[PDB]
Each structure stands twice: as structure tokens, then as C-alpha cells.
Design a protein around this ligand. Structure first.
Ligand code: WAQ
Ligand code: WAQ
Ligand code: MG
Ligand code: MG
Ligand code: PT
Ligand code: PT
Ligand code: PT
Ligand code: PT
Ligand code: PT
Ligand code: PT
Lengths: 247, 247
């Protein structure tokens, strides 16, 4: 009854990143999961790939189980309104306005980062040295049956895109060096994003960009005296399962 | 357009004891079936269940050469020591000097861990490649099943995919002008038939090359060429070949 990390990446054609996925599962779900990842890479709205890697490996570290972040959905009528709300939420979560503004000026240049960017709240600058690779959070997952119940109860659609985002966001927010996350999709067909943090949980914002744009974003705002490589190793390696508790 | 699809699997981490490997060359619309076949093949291998696996695909741009399989002849022997003796004889008849053969047989035991093939230079009486435990992995060859089944029927050989794969590989490799001979037997404890292959005598199966239950296998290509080893490695890894038999 050991668990397995299963990862996928796909690209078209410096190939254009198409898709990526990370799962953490018991062995008997291997076929379904390899197939799900396969399908997800093949039928992606960003294009059809000519390169793909799928990989699995046994996880030896013990698995921590946590609840998902509390969720609140902020209806907005347009992107400029959502982005404005997001900047306000980041501030209320503890990021200084100047650090936010500095980050927003560089977000456009980070659109091609395949993973996430780490931004130091002390130095007002990018902290990681992974460049276009970014920091890829992995070994987190949310068993589907539990997620469906959570969706039902939370009156949210049971879209796997939400399951994956919230699993990621809950793992990342747990890290003591992470004050906040800002995310929206690089998929032209999906405009909802979020801001997430310990105090205000997972704050969905229903419009963060215009349809048809392919620029997405993932930034983790970091407050830590420790070195960045420690934080990177935690985000990449530490296994997390989400389990929401009905009571 | 065609796609190279590759798999490797190991136990006790990645390349750890090598469990399985596979290489396919297919049109895009056979991707799901082929990813699944490779998955299945790694999961149910007689050498153990893996705790690591990689499956990968990529578009092939080089144009595809189609060739006939090597002529086949089956040598019945009563024991391993006899098959090995016959194999040494066949290698000599194919053009390898006795001294080079003996030198190779002294090293074969330490090469059991090589995940791919070993290249042995007839000019130096020594190993030619610098890949150590990785070895040289031949790929981008395949034999459409329908055609293979006919060939098996007509040749009075069992239509086992293990033979399809070995003969596809041996035919690609023997075509390379710098390859005088190949010596192979399986690293699978349940399969004791091996072969020697070359241009003059084709694909010579030897029905006993080791004792049942041993996991030491072998794959050595004897090289006589005027070029550097990296060229030959690139040819073996990169030249796309489909087998198509005709009477
Ligand atoms: N595992 C990861 N680790 C770090 N960054 C990642 C990871 N996966 C994706 N990213 C980065 O995040 C960017 C966005 O990727 P995507 O998968 O397109 O992101 C989304 O779908 C976000 C959806 C949030 C709203 C869901 C909801 O309705 O509640 C992508 O470009 C990468 O830069
Ligand atoms: N694609 C490759 N490229 C280079 N070396 C390879 C490759 N595939 C396998 N090898 C090497 O060969 C070794 C064993 O390969 P296996 O897949 O175990 O090979 C076999 O089943 C051999 C079949 C013998 C003849 C079949 C028959 O006519 O009845 C393996 O451990 C590697 O070291
Ligand atoms: Mg094989
Ligand atoms: Mg084998
Ligand atoms: Pt493209
Ligand atoms: Pt394309
Ligand atoms: Pt607040
Ligand atoms: Pt083992
Ligand atoms: Pt094992
Ligand atoms: Pt001969």
C-alpha cells in the first residue's frame, strides 16, 4: 500500500509548453492515471504536442494529509476588476503594495515559465534561479471521490482543474515561508484565477484575463531567512494528499 | 508523420535494477494503444515489479527506411555450454577473430548490468562505447504486427513479440555497415534462447544460452569501422527502421 508520484510534461515544437500534470496515487490506479495524464496532454487547448514524457516513481517519504483551504468565490464583471481585487487580497494577506507592484511589472516576462516563480517580499525580487523552468510543485493529489463530495458541499463545479489548483494551493500555503500565491491559467479558454494565503484561504476571482489570451501566471510570495533551495526541495518533494472532512 | 515511443522501468529507484525497456515507432493515431502496451509490458515483467518507469514519445523527422528481416535459422542444442560454444563458432564464421571473441567473453559477466548494448571494437579488442552501465540503446525500429504474424507463420516460428522485437533490433543493427556481429541472450530468467546475428549467416537462434532462473543476459555488437564511436551511437539511436517482410 505504497504511494506513487506520477508526472507528465508535453510540448509543441525551445519547445512551447503545452501541458503538465502531477499525481500521487496508490499503485492500483496506475493505468487510469497514466491514461488520464496522457489524455490531458493530447487534447489540450494550447495545441497538440510532438513531445511528451510520463513518469512514475515510488514515494518513500511518508505522506501528510491535510484539509483544503477554505474557499470563497469573488464574482467580478471584468479582468481589470479581478486584478484590482487580487492586488487588494494580496495586501490584506501581508504583501506590501510596493512588492506587489514590482511583481506585476515582471509578470509579463514570466509568462513562459513552466512552473512557478518565487518572489522575495524582503528584496522585492525574484528569488529562484530556475529561469524558464520555474519551480514545479509536485507529489500532491486529491482522491476524486472526496473531491466530488467537497465540490457538492461547497457549491463549486467538480472540475478537475479546480481539484488540481486547490490541491496545489493548499500544499503551497501550508509552507511556513509562503505568504501568498497569485495564479491564473495559461489556457485561452479559462479566465478564472485565484489568490491564496493562510488567512483568507483560496480566493477565486472569476475573471483574471480576457478569453483567448495564453499568458498565465503563478507566483509564490516568500518570506524566509532560509535559502531558496530548501524551499524548492520542499515544494517539489514533500508528499501531500488532500482530504476534506465531512464533519 | 511517425513517432518514437520509448519506455524504461527499474526496481529500487531509477537507473537500481533494470526491469524492462521497450521501443516502438508508430503513426500518431496508435499512441494510446502503444503507450498502454508499453505500460503493461513494464508492469508484468518476470524480473520484478518496478518502482520507477518512464514512457516518452517524440516526432521523428528523419525519413523512415523499410527493410526485410534477416534470414532466420534455428540451432537446437542440448545445453548452455553447447550453445555458447556454437555461438563462438558462429561469431568466428562471421568474421570476428578468436582472440577478440575470447576477450569479450571475459568481460561479459561484468556487463550483465548494462541496460543497453555494449560495443566491442575488433581493432582494439576492447569496449568502444563510454556509456558504462547505461549502454547504447537502439531505438526507432518496429515491425507492424500483421506483417510479423505472416512472417512467423511462413517461417514456422512462434509469433511471440519477444522474437518480433529481437529480430527487428537485430535486422536494424546488422544493416549498419560498421557492425560485423551481434551476440545476444535474454536477461529474463524464464527465457533461455539467444542468438548470434550478422550479414553472412543472418539471425542464428540458439535454443539454450543459459540456465533457467539466471538473470544475467547479454547484448554485444562487434564493430569494425573507420569512424568514431559517437557517430555509430547516434546511428543506432536515431535511424528509423520499419521491418516489412516479403516472400
Ligand atoms: N505544478 C506546478 N507547480 C508550479 N507551477 C505550476 C504547476 N503547474 C502549473 N504551474 C504554473 O501555473 C500556470 C498555470 O497553469 P494552469 O494549469 O493553466 O492553471 C490553472 O488552471 C489555474 C486555475 C485556477 C482557478 C481554478 C478555479 O476555478 O478555482 C502554468 O503556466 C505554470 O506556469
Ligand atoms: N533496444 C536495445 N538496444 C540495445 N540493447 C538492448 C536493447 N534492448 C535490450 N537490450 C539489451 O539486451 C538485453 C536483454 O534484452 P531482452 O529484451 O531480455 O532480449 C531478449 O528477450 C532476447 C531474445 C533472444 C532471441 C529471441 C528468439 O529468437 O527467440 C537487455 O538487458 C539489454 O542489455
Ligand atoms: Mg526487449
Ligand atoms: Mg529483458
Ligand atoms: Pt506551437
Ligand atoms: Pt502544433
Ligand atoms: Pt482578509
Ligand atoms: Pt529488486
Ligand atoms: Pt521488487
Ligand atoms: Pt556460416
Amino acid at each position: 500500500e505504497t504511494f506513487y508520484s506520477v508526472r507528465m510534461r508535453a510540448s509543441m515544437n525551445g519547445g512551447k509548453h503545452i501541458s503538465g500534470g502531477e499525481r500521487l496515487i496508490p499503485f492500483h490506479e496506475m493505468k487510469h492515471t497514466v491514461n488520464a495524464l496522457l489524455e490531458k496532454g493530447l487534447s489540450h487547448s494550447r495545441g497538440k504536442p510532438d513531445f511528451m514524457q510520463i513518469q512514475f516513481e515510488e514515494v518513500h517519504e511518508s505522506i501528510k494529509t491535510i484539509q483544503p483551504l477554505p474557499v470563497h468565490t469573488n464574482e467580478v464583471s471584468c479582468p481589470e476588476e479581478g486584478q484590482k481585487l487580487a492586488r487588494l487580497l494580496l495586501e490584506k494577506e501581508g504583501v506590501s503594495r510596493d512588492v506587489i507592484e514590482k511583481a506585476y511589472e515582471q509578470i509579463p516576462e514570466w509568462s513562459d515559465v513552466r512552473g512557478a516563480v518565487l518572489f522575495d517580499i524582503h528584496t522585492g525580487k525574484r528569488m529562484d534561479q530556475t529561469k524558464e523552468k520555474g519551480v514545479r510543485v509536485s507529489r500532491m493529489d486529491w482522491p476524486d471521490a472526496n473531491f466530488e463530495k467537497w465540490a457538492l458541499h461547497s457549491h463549486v463545479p467538480a472540475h478537475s482543474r479546480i481539484k488540481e489548483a486547490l490541491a496545489l494551493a493548499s500544499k503551497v500555503s501550508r509552507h511556513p515561508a509562503v505568504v501568498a500565491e497569485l495564479c491564473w491559467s495559461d489556457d485561452p479558454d479559462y479566465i478564472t484565477g485565484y489568490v491564496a494565503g493562510k488567512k483568507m484561504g483560496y480566493q477565486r476571482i472569476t475573471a483574471m484575463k480576457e478569453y483567448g489570451t495564453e499568458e498565465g501566471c503563478r507566483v509564490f510570495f516568500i518570506d524566509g531567512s532560509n535559502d531558496v533551495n530548501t524551499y524548492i526541495h520542499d515544494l517539489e518533494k514533500q508528499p501531500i494528499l488532500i482530504e476534506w472532512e465531512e464533519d
